[PDB]
Design a protein around this ligand. Structure first.
Ligand SMILES: CCCCCCCCCCCCC/C=C/[C@@H](O)[C@@H](N)COP(=O)(O)OCC[N+](C)(C)C
Ligand SMILES: CCCCCCCCCCCCC/C=C/[C@@H](O)[C@@H](N)COP(=O)(O)OCC[N+](C)(C)C
Ligand SMILES: CCCCCCCCCCCCC/C=C/[C@@H](O)[C@@H](N)COP(=O)(O)OCC[N+](C)(C)C
Ligand SMILES: [Ca+2]
Ligand SMILES: [Ca+2]
Ligand SMILES: [Ca+2]
Ligand SMILES: [Ca+2]
Length: 142
């Protein structure tokens, strides 16, 4: 179950998508995010992505709809997770480093302290090596 701190973190993630701060994520904003993460969805693809999440059918994603998606996470999806992993593991060595995570967050327009980046890595790190491997990443997502 979600906690206060975790809901507040998902709200911060939502604000990285909601570029114009109007409280909804549009296809355009989703496209911007996806491209900043190295993906190249078409217009129709973006519409399909929003449609999966858009509970009230208004064509945009509000925070309760975003949180509804995040709450459930993934369940028993393989290939999308490897693609997401590769977004972060830009050198391809199989480990997400704090520098790699910070670079991603900077491309999304989030400026974080070193403490904050380390805290993020710590939350997903299981073995304590200070990096996130794929098995760790899968467990975070599911
Ligand atoms: C076509 C296939 C698409 C698969 C790629 C999906 C890309 C996933 C992008 C995930 C973005 C994550 C960031 O928004 C979060 N790490 C933000 O963390 P925050 O909670 O603000 O700290
Ligand atoms: C704290 C961590 C924040 C992580 C935010 C993750 C976002 C990813 O799930 C992205 N794939 C963006 O999702 P969105 O574009 O809102 O909708 C995905 C559509 N789909 C359900 C059909 C995959
Ligand atoms: C369908 C597949 C797409 C799902 C991608 C989901 C993206 C979520 C962010 C990916 C996480 C990568 C890890 O290296 C770290 N970002 C873990 O961050 P996290 O622990 O989720 O951040 C929460 C904020 N906090 C750490 C400060 C608590
Ligand atoms: Ca917006
Ligand atoms: Ca909506
Ligand atoms: Ca790496
Ligand atoms: Ca690790």
């Amino acid at each position: 179950q979600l906690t206060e701190e975790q809901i507040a973190e998902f709200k911060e993630a939502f604000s990285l998508f909601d570029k114009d701060g109007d409280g909804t994520i549009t296809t355009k904003e989703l496209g911007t995010v996806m491209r900043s993460l190295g993906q190249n969805p078409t217009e129709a693809e973006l519409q399909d992505m929003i449609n999966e999440v858009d509970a009230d059918g208004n064509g945009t994603i509000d925070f309760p709809e975003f949180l509804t998606m995040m709450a459930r996470k993934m369940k028993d999806s393989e290939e999308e997770i490897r693609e997401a992993f590769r977004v972060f593991d830009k050198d391809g060595n199989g480990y997400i480093s704090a520098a790699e995570l910070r670079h991603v967050m900077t491309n999304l327009g989030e400026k974080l302290t070193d403490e904050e980046v380390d805290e993020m890595i710590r939350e997903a790190d299981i073995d304590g090596d200070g990096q996130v491997n794929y098995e760790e990443f899968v467990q975070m997502m599911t």
